[PDB]
Amino acid sequence: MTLRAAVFDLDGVLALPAVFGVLGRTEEALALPRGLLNDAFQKGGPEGATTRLMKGEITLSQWIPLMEENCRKCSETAKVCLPKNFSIKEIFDKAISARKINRPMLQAALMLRKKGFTTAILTNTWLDDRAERDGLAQLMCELKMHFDFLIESCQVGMVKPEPQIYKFLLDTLKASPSEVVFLDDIGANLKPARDLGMVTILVQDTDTALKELEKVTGIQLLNTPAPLPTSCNPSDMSHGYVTVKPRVRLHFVELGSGPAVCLCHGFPESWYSWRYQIPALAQAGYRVLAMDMKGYGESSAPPEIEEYCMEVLCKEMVTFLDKLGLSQAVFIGHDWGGMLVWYMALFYPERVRAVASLNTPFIPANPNMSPLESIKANPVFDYQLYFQEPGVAEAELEQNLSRTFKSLFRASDESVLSMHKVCEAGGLFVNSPEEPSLSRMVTEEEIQFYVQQFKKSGFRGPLNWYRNMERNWKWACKSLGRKILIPALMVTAEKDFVLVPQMSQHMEDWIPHLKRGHIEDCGHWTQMDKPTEVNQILIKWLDSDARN
Amino acid sequence: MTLRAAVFDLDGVLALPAVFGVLGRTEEALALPRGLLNDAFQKGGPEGATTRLMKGEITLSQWIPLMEENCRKCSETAKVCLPKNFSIKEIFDKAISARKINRPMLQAALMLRKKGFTTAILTNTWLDDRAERDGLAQLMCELKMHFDFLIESCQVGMVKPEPQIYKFLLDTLKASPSEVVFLDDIGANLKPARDLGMVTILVQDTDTALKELEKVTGIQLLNTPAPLPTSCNPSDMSHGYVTVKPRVRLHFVELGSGPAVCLCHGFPESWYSWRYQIPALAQAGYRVLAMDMKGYGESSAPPEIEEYCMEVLCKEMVTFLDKLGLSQAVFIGHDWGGMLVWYMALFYPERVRAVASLNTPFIPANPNMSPLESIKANPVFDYQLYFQEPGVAEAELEQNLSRTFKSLFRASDESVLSMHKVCEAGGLFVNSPEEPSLSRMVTEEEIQFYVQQFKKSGFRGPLNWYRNMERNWKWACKSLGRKILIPALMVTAEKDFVLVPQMSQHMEDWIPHLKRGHIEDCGHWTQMDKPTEVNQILIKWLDSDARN
Ligand SMILES: CC(C)C(=O)N1CCC(NC(=O)Nc2ccc(C(F)(F)F)cc2)CC1
Ligand SMILES: CC(C)C(=O)N1CCC(NC(=O)Nc2ccc(C(F)(F)F)cc2)CC1
Ligand SMILES: [Mg+2]
Ligand SMILES: [Mg+2]
């Protein structure tokens, strides 16, 4: 029984600038007797203030005075006085926020966990009731939600170097000492582990630390590539449900706090298309609500084609905002989601805090030209005609849902799905394989997630979005004298061969402060093709344009 | 066919300081030629800038310059100049926010609607893309969600005095002109109505306006009592679902934006117990999440008794926060909810932004005394023993769910449910009626809502909360050296004969900055007994203690 577990210290291992390294730092800053503070801190030993703290017996605020008091007499015996504007509260405040996640370490904990390793945190921590306690609280969710366990001293009532806590850890890990690795910055904290037969690593500089793990675990950890952003596990999400209308209920997934951000996916997808942006943006400081749009998934998908014109669709969201209590929301859409977002900007500005589109441009309708005409004047939009006749297009998509999704979600350098002559050919897939190979963009499981969803209600509803060309052309002509003068971002994908980035080139005529973003080497499925830069671009524009 | 509909102007009828009354006000403020501004505004008539605005042809920001331009030459012909620091943007900004809901008018629209009247708003409004557009956007949800319809000019493409919009209204109202009353502040806006045969009222001072309606409708509207806060319609709520654990999913209802506020109900209730506080608090500036607590309703209710000790229950919420992306939340509980909130404060401060209890005090456990002992030393807690033996208590409650809820939810001056000798008597209801009369606190329907919920999973789970006295006593003794030093409010109910307000009198010993609130003339069911003062007390403490 060799390794299958990985346990991490917090202060000094997963989170850096470690507090204790300020403990001292300060002394120096203030010409204090070397270590004075650090004695006060450890004063009493097992039966001292700081242990009681770490055990949960008392709380951070309860402890501040006991520390200061200890400090008093650490300096009385050292025949000295403290400064007269001296503050234990300030020190720890600065220190506790000063401290940020150690990124490579976390990334290595991911890497291991990605490969079957049960991961946990073991840390000597306290019950934080400081007026400013949230900052730490914030950091803990960011961490903990990447581990099997988080074991805190003040939570379990035992401390770290006391044996019984390691016993507690093993118990939690469902494991035996030789199956487990444990990293820490204090040597005293290491020894007990070993005595039971644990692999241990003294963490000093972080990346020799990694070397040791790397070796003893037999897994590239250092210098491992940049990894995809955090995905979502549907079963561990908050699912929301709003019946927006007698027989239309809309489903969404919700994570985060702050300014509401609404993500609207394109043809044939699900809220899952945003799996990479949800934790990212939530993390960046927002409340994300990722819709199943009408017709998809756990939202309702009513048969009638009218039920899917832009105008109807738009009111429904406005209701969605209504029934949730939201006066505004930032709207980011992709593919079809793109155009809808655009029409929320043009018809309900008071409701749209800011607006954002991946790939899908804004084209104002040509009030002379019919749109069934307009599409015909363009080889690549030939597929949209194929989609008009109710039923034809559905049988082909529904026929094999794996084949179908597998044939769509593929990256630029990867295709087995082409664009035109689609009506002559008489199939979207007329000339593609029955068992198409996995794209670099999707696991097998991910594809099956989609297969579940679309077993519910098929493509009738989704394919309906293409069946209101006429009505939407008309609706759209109402807005022909307007302009978008609210925060608005147009993200273009180099190699999306349908939402081509030239199509967007005049958009600044009707949107004069339009900010932009552009993804090199990116096919149509933006959010799973180039998730990280997608996240990078979006968070930055939110922060600059959507906060205040 | 006499009246059954009621239609309201916005500016000057449902919302006061009407904008146009600033239009002029300003002129005076700045020694401008009387009405100069008001001409510029109406300049062009039907074919002018302001109509296009009102029709949706263009937008507020699009219009600002056209107005200023018009203003230029209204003053050129008046042989005059404007000031050199002159701003149409500022004026309307101040004006648009200056304007608040006309309360009595809205209240009268409620009153009528409460009595079978289809209510709507008809208003000449614009597409707001001002940098500061939310303020108005905010006001509109507050209003609109109390009406059958909101009909906006720029939304329908027709304007108010043009006939075709009235036709549009009738159509929407499913009504004929003589069945409808229409209030407005402009006479021109009145006339078309009448020509089709509509009852009309020129709104000047608001309460002669009311007199007219009062009479022509034959319904007390003026001087009508203070009305209960807005309730929730379950079907028009956002329902959320978090599986917090393999087979425990927690349900909640969510409304609002801002700092998260978590409401936790007491024995045997539902998130519906907060029906009066949800819109109120949401409205006050918060994101409310009202739980079905474990054991109730659409949350999971697993059989085992352990599954309901405070410690288990607490982690589950902490998870709930986790899986929703919330670092903190304000916790307000009632009855059992009260105690749980308290233990969230004592065991997870980093997570509790602030803490609040209705009725339920904080008592620290007596580490010498057993609690099964402790309860016995008190006539009134005799019922808790009745609840210990699994099954006995459930058959009696489940036997008749109407009888049961109807027998509980009753106000102080109202009872048919007593407290003690409950074991000897051998029933909670041993001596109450089979068809108990409706309390002033509940409609019949409301009772049935509860009956639905509890048909799902009965009282096993809820009654379990009383079956971990021992375990919780133990858990609780861990916190005996701690204190609550976070924002914390103890709301006491005069006439709650079990959560008596003396029981809370030493709480300041362990909570030294505890703020308080106190409800005269209030039984145990605080939130439906005294909703308005409940809302008043809570919002004020949130604003002062929970914002920053
Ligand atoms: C102004 C135009 C570009 C616009 O707003 N549009 C038209 C184009 C539309 N998007 C798509 O057609 N997307 C799409 C997605 C998937 C496929 C499929 F996979 F080929 F079937 C084909 C097309 C989005 C809305
Ligand atoms: C410290 C004590 C007071 C405490 O925290 N407690 C004990 C009392 C408990 N609340 C109740 O017993 N509530 C209640 C509610 C309803 C009934 C019933 F309707 F009689 F059945 C009876 C009792 C709430 C938690
Ligand atoms: Mg450490
Ligand atoms: Mg008016």
UniProtKB/Swiss-Prot annotation, chains A, B:
Pfam families: Abhydrolase_1 (PF00561), Hydrolase (PF00702). CDD domains: HAD_sEH-N_like (cd02603). A lipid is attached at residue 522 (S-(15-deoxy-Delta12,14-prostaglandin J2-9-yl)cysteine). Inhibited by 1-(1-acetylpiperidin-4-yl)-3-(4-(trifl uoromethoxy)phenyl)urea (TPAU), 1-cyclohexyl-3-dodecylurea (CDU), 12-(3-adamantan-1-yl-ureido)-dodecanoic acid (AUDA), 1-((3S, 5S, 7S)-adamantan-1-yl)-3-(5-(2-(2-ethoxyethoxy) ethoxy)pentyl)urea (AEPU), N-adamantyl-N[']-cyclohexyl urea (ACU), 4-(((1S, 4S)-4-(3-((3S, 5S, 7S)-adamantan-1-yl) ureido)cyclohexyl)oxy)benzoic acid (c-AUCB), 4-(((1R, 4R)-4-(3-((3S, 5S, 7S)-adamantan-1-yl)ureido)cyclohexyl)oxy)benzoic acid (t-AUCB), 4-(((1R, 4R)-4-(3-(4(trifluoromethoxy)phenyl)ureido)cyclohexyl)oxy)benzoic acid (t-TAUCB) and to a lesser extent by 8-(3-((3S, 5S, 7S)-adamantan-1-yl)ureido) octanoic acid (AUOA). The keyword ATP-binding does not apply. Residues 1-224 are annotated as: Phosphatase. The modification N6-succinyllysine is found at residues 55, 421, 455. The active site is at residues 335, 466, 524. Mg(2+) binds at residues 9, 11, 185. InterPro entries: AB_hydrolase_1, AB_hydrolase_fold, Epox_hydrolase-like, HAD-like_sf, HAD-SF_hydro_IA, HAD-SF_ppase_IA/epoxid_hydro_N, HAD_sf, PGP-like_dom2. Its EC number is 3.3.2.10, 3.1.3.76. Disulfide bonds: none annotated. Residues 259-531 form the AB hydrolase-1 domain. The modification Phosphoserine is found at residue 370. Belongs to the AB hydrolase superfamily. Epoxide hydrolase family. This is Bifunctional epoxide hydrolase 2. It comes from Homo sapiens (Human).
